Structures are given as structure tokens and as C-alpha cells.
Amino acid sequence: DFDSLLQRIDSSCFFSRMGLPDVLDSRVILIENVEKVFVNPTDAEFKGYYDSVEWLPTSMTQEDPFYVLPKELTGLRIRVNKAVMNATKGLSKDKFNYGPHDFSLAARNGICFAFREYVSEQYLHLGNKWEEVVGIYFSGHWPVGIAKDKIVTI
Amino acid sequence: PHVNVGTIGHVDHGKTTLTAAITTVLAKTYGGAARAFDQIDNAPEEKARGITINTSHVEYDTPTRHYAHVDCPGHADYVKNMITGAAQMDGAILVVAATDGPMPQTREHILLGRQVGVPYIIVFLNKCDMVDDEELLELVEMEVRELLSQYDFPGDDTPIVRGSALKALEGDAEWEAKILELAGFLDSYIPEPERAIDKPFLLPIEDVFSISGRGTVVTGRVERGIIKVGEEVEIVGIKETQKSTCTGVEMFRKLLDEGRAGENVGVLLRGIKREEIERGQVLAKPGTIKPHTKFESEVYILSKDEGGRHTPFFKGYRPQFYFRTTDVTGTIELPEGVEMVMPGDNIKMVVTLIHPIAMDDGLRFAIREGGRTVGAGVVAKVLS
Amino acid sequence: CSTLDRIIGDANKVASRGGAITAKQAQILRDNLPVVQRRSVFQNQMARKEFVRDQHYLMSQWEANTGRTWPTGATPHHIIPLESGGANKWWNLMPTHGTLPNHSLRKALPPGTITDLRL
Ligand SMILES: Nc1nc2c(ncn2[C@@H]2O[C@H](COP(=O)(O)OP(=O)(O)O)[C@@H](O)[C@H]2O)c(=O)[nH]1
Ligand SMILES: [Mg+2]
């Protein structure tokens, strides 16, 4: 199953539909760009959820907001990390920058984190929280935040 | 057997603590002199071409090698030393904190590393005493290998030592073996620096005469290699490379079989006339160096305090580029979204000379205005 | 004005008497840390731990590089906050009276955000 995960990661178009108006799930709250999520946010665009939103991890040193890993799992994390890094090279920073800020490293660390924990999630049978998030990454978007049952995404 | 090295990476990642640690652990194990953090951190000022650079020079010895090691307090210092600094690094120790991971000066110091022609980079992953989980160390190693390979360094084959500069310096025998490991990789990974005497012949032309009956002679110092009498030689420079043969080599009236590296000689040629030799031309071993008009560079423009410009320049800037013996004019091309270069800046800069100079990647040069220096650069990529 | 011009200006309004950010300091600040990367809680706890250890050393280096006595009872304040990707270096320090809170020129930016302080 982890082999068909590698294939789907290897054929993905990560961050390719950012700002675009695809269909998407109910929990999703689409926001246009990095500017209007991180720099000049409006409570209207967040649909009243701004005060509850908490950024999904963008650093491997951050804690899991949802939930000793079997060394078998630990390795599956190394291998899916490498593969996610292979699928996220040379990203146009134009779409990840506003004024002095660049979010492409935050995004790359964030997609790597979400897939490592998705692997911990499906291996251990913890639940579907990261599955929700990884599904949005496969749809071509960046899930940046979580507000109650909702997921803020670009 | 002497090798130039030094420590690079972001502020606070442990370059100076590591430099300190290396000196004490090597002095304790193989002999030499321990150097304190204080004396290294509080670096004195160097002044090359009136450019100020805060720089500590340590020496340390492995059983097989002698190291001259540079360490600087600030990014600013490293920018100037890589572009302008006297001793070019034969290899660099990139220090990355396992805590912070790569930061903007981790990426900058690898980028400038490639641009300047630093041939080898080794990695000390520091503060591993503060980061217990190995997966984190493993994922940080993977962040670094991919950052290295992004700028054409062999990330897969890069030696990366997991260590602790502070704990090694404090005397903890556990973390001391990591410093010996690292120094080991200096000895094994960095090849013996390629000596000038063994490189292909090159002599910048500093004067020219026509000797009575004998023909054309060009004077100069031999930068590298050996020119023997009766060898083929090319005149690469301001015009189509000219083919000639060395008929003689005289040093102050005394005839020689060979002109060697470091020596000032007159080089007697065949057929070529006095009027075909030009300012900035070199003698070179045929097909070893080629003429270039356009190239990519990294440049540091001196501040006003360093006796540079008081005002900024624009795309329409048309300065003199002094390579070896003489100035040559050129138009510049700035990188995207940039239309201005202040005093004390450093930018990538695409240059087109109005006529070509023999150059490879890594050649140093100066930007000038009416005699006086206003910048210092290095050829990152020859073109055209 | 750059984001850094705003940071230095705001910091000089709070600087302890005889602890202003001199034009020389501001030049060294810009040259040695133009671009910063936002830190995690863990990473910032690590940078704070190192500062606490070297506080007295860094304060003495501030005194030597600016030629000024450290103001009596002044607290070492980080001009670029450590949590914003600031440095534990004399040139990123400034005497303040009391521990004043820090920020950066709305929710906190996610760790790994790169901020070019010259823009
Ligand atoms: N815990 C720990 N702290 C370290 C280590 N290496 C450096 N440091 C700390 O990092 C801070 C800055 O180190 P320094 O060598 O000045 O970094 P540089 O600016 O790159 O030269 C100081 O507090 C050191 O004590 C290490 O291996 N472990
Ligand atoms: Mg230092």
C-alpha cells in the first residue's frame, strides 16, 4: 500500500491549483493567496473562523495538532519524506511570496510533515485527520490552517 | 602539506565554537595549540584594497596535513572574504544547527560557495546534544543534502558529521570523537590542492620588445606551469588566439631551457611581430584557456567608507574591468527586479566586455573608475 | 523605509538612556542579518537557552563594539526577536529598562517563513 502511495506522490502536482476555484470538500475554506491568509486577513474571507484558526505545522520541530514509533514506521517516514521532497523541487516562489515574506519553505516543510504523520496515521490506525489534509494536497492545494471542523486552504 | 579551510553557515550555528573545539581536540590527540572561543570570536580587521573584513586565522594540524582556517563573526564578513579574501578556500566546513536547520545564511553560503568556485563542502551538524530524536537528525541531514545538490554539490556523497562543538570543547570524550571524525574527513575528502607548478603554462604579458635580429620578446611573471624552448604556445586575449612557438627564454641576459612558475622572464616567440602583442593578453599552453567576452559574476561594490562610490549605479553603468594587467570596458546586466546597486552591496552581474579576455570560472577581477577601485568580483560562469 | 528601518526606529523609542542603536550598529545589523527565518517554539526555546548562558559575554561585547558602558539595570533586548529568526550577537542587542515584550512588523507567521528585512 505504501508503494502505491509513493506512485501517487511521484505523479502529483503539489501546489499547482493554489488560488484556483476547484470543487473541494465542505470543511475546506478556500483563500485566494498567501497575502490574504498570513499578511492582510479578513474575517469575511475566513467566514468568521479567523480567531480559531491555528496554522498546521510548517517545521519538523512542531507538534502534531491532531493525535515510540515502531522503527519500521520511522523508516516509512524517511522514505515518504524523500519522495515528497522529490515532488516539491523548484517551486515558483512568486505564488509563495508577498511584500518581504516567502512561504515556500513553510509550505515544503508543511507538506512533508503532513505526509509523515499521514503514514503514522494509516500504519497505527489513529484516524482520518491527516487523511483529510493529505487529500487537499493531492487536489493541488495547500491546507494552511485548521479552525474547529474547517480546514483553511489556498 | 598545507590546506586552506574555514567554517561557514548562519549566525549562532556554532562555527566559532567548532573552530575552538577542533583546535583543542586535535592539540589533545595529536599535538599543537588550543585556541579559546574569545580570541577567535573577537576577530581583528583585515584591509585588502581598503576593504574591511573581520577575520580570525587559526592553524591546526592533522598527522598528514597543516590547516589554515578562517572564521568570521558576521555574514557581511563571509560575503567579502569569499568574493575578495586573499586565500581561496580549498574546502569549507558548513555548520548547520540540528535545532534551527538550514537558515537563509545556510543557503546563501552554499550559493556563494558555488559562485566563487569553492570546490568541496563538508558538513558539521551541530547542537546534536540538544536534539535527542534521530529521525529529526536524519530529516535535517536530508534537508542539507538536497540544499547542497540544489547548487551542484554532491549532496549524496557529502560527509556529514553529527556532533556537538560545545560539549567537545567542554572535554566530554563522547563528543570529542565527532571532531576527530570531521578532521578525518578534511584529510580524506579534500584532495591535495593542485600546485601552480603542475598546472598548464600561463604567463600574463606585462611588456613587449623586439630584440636585435632575434625577433619578438614578451616579459612577465609565469603564473603557473613551465614553458620550455621549442614548445607550441598560443597568444589568447584581445584578438583571435595567435599560434606561435617559444624559440627562447632569457632571464636578465641569461638564456634558459625553461621558464618556470614564479619567475620573471622574457619569452622569445616565432614569426609573431611586436605589434601583434596587446595589453591584457597571456601566453598559454595551446587549447587550455579560451577567450570570453560575456560571463556571469558575483561582485562586491565597496562602500563609501572603504573608498568606493558615494552614489548608487544603474543598468546603464559602464565601468572598467581590471583582470590581470590592464582595464577593459563592459556593459552590465542586473538580475530580475533589480535596477540599482548601492555602495557596500553584492549582486550577481552578467558582463559583456567590448573585447575578450582569457578566463575560466573562478578568475578574480576588479571594477574601477578612473584608476581607483570601486568593486571586486569573481567569474562564476563564462558564456558566449 | 525597509521593515528593518521600522524595527530599528521602534527599538530606539524604547532604548535605555545611553543605549541607542547607533548608525554604526544599524549598518552592522542590516549587513549581518538582512534575511530571517521564523522559528518554532522548540527552536526559540533553544536560542533563548543559549542567550541566557552567554548574556554577560554578549553584553560586554556590546560595550566594546559601541564604546559605551552598559546602562545600570538595563535588560538585554533582542532588536530582531529570537522567535523571528534573530541572533544572539552584540549588534542585535539594545539596553531597555525592564523586560519589554517583543513582536515583529493578526496571527504569528508560521515557522519557516523567510522575511527579507531590506524589503
Ligand atoms: N548546546 C549547544 N550549544 C552550542 C553548540 N555549539 C554552539 N553552541 C552555542 O551557540 C551559541 C553561538 O555559537 P557560535 O560558535 O558563536 O556560533 P557562530 O555565530 O556560528 O560562530 C553559543 O551559545 C554556543 O554556546 C553545541 O554543540 N551545543
Ligand atoms: Mg563566529
Side-chain angles (χ1 to χ4, degrees), chain B residues 208-325:
Chain B
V208 64
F209 307 91
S210 53
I211 302 186
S212 308
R214 304 186 71 201
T216 310
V217 68
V218 300
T219 67
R221 163 164 285 100
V222 179
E223 276 191 12
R224 56 182 208 236
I226 311 176
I227 184 62
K228 294 193 170 60
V229 168
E231 293 191 310
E232 185 68 20
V233 59
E234 286 179 10
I235 306 182
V236 191
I238 316 306
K239 294 170 63 69
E240 213 177 350
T241 78
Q242 295 175 337
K243 288 175 183 175
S244 182
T245 310
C246 169
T247 50
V249 174
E250 78 98 336
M251 169 173 215
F252 206 121
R253 98 190 275 182
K254 220 211 82 191
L255 293 320
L256 307 172
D257 287 23
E258 63 178 9
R260 306 172 64 73
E263 295 180 351
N264 298 293
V265 293
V267 181
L268 295 177
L269 298 185
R270 170 171 287 119
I272 195 81
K273 190 171 63 184
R274 183 170 174 286
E275 304 188 324
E276 296 171 308
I277 304 302
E278 295 282 311
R279 281 166 171 279
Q281 284 183 349
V282 304
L283 268 69
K285 201 257 197 57
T288 62
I289 197 170
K290 293 148 60 69
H292 294 280
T293 193
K294 188 173 180 176
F295 63 85
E296 306 185 37
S297 64
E298 195 75 22
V299 296
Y300 172 83
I301 292 67
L302 308 204
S303 78
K304 183 185 180 179
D305 302 71
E306 301 178 309
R309 294 171 56 77
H310 40 291
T311 68
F313 66 65
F314 302 82
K315 187 194 174 180
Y317 186 52
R318 296 188 59 232
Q320 316 149 197
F321 298 76
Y322 188 95
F323 278 98
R324 302 182 218 259
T325 328

